[PDB]
Amino acid sequence: QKLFVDKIREYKSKRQTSGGPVDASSEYQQELERELFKLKQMFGNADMNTFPTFKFEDPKFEVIEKP
Template structure:
């Protein structure tokens, strides 16, 4: 335990580490029941329909066409 850490901080960090290991072991949310999983799947499907599908966790790729500029006739 580092010198500046009080027992409450240590307990907090221990609980965070425990939750993290449970999260990795579960492969997702720790205490998510079937109701929550179903609601999550419905919301993800709704977002995919709304935003055209694809990977919702990836940043979208933007392509901007080069603007067509009309040349101004010199007078």
């Protein structure tokens, strides 16, 4: 069953990634950069890793009594 030994050996090889922060991708950064950039720029443009700040506006008004 070469299929099964293939599966188990590749599982043991991929789980061997504590040494490989990406497990030897050696590419796909040129696209991951754009993917995450677009994901950010559609979610927003601030530092989305920090706590949000909040400005609070207040409504307008007018004279109400008889002029």
